[PDB]
């Protein structure tokens, strides 16, 4: 059910039924919060922070282990993004495509994808303006 594509993939993560920390997890919740703060200070996004914690520290889910999401933990410590992470990456992908189109004006395929990417930015930018996550005057490039 892809938007802007015909793909019908269903690949995803399967959250476990149990909402509690694993019995084998024996690390303090405070130490996990501190690790989240150090990673964010080095400049990692919340998605990448979860990958490092889950891959190398046994943190199955930050909410399950600490009771709060990574997004909420960082904001409690003064770490918050300028714009939402998903919108952030869409703008960067548009920028890389537009930079490529400056040098390569015959790349009609890249010209097509920029239209799809920009239309995806407008739909997402519209949503964040409604929820007040984004200032009403915010417009893309």
């Amino acid at each position: 059910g892809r938007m802007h594509s015909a793909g019908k993939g269903i690949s995803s993560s399967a959250i476990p039924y149990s909402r509690n920390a694993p019995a084998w997890f024996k690390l303090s919740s405070e130490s996990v919060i501190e690790q989240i703060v150090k990673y964010a200070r080095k400049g990692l996004t919340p998605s990448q922070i979860g990958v490092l914690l889950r891959d190398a520290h046994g943190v199955t889910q930050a909410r399950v282990i600490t009771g709060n999401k990574i997004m909420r933990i960082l904001k409690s410590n003064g770490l918050a993004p300028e714009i939402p992470e998903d919108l952030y990456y869409l703008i960067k992908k548009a920028v890389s495509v537009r930079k490529h189109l400056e040098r390569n004006r015959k790349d009609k395929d890249a010209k097509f994808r920029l239209i799809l990417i920009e239309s995806r930015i407008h739909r997402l930018a519209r949503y964040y303006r409604t929820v007040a996550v984004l200032p009403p005057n915010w417009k893309y490039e």
Binding site: A40, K42, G43, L44, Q48, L52, A80, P81, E82
Partner: peptide
């Protein structure tokens, strides 16, 4: 971790960039 780090993602990062801009 260094290659995955973003220079402009957090509000303090843009403020720091704002600081050096002027």
């Amino acid at each position: 971790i260094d290659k995955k780090a973003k220079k402009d993602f957090y509000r303090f990062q843009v403020r720091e960039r704002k600081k050096q801009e002027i």
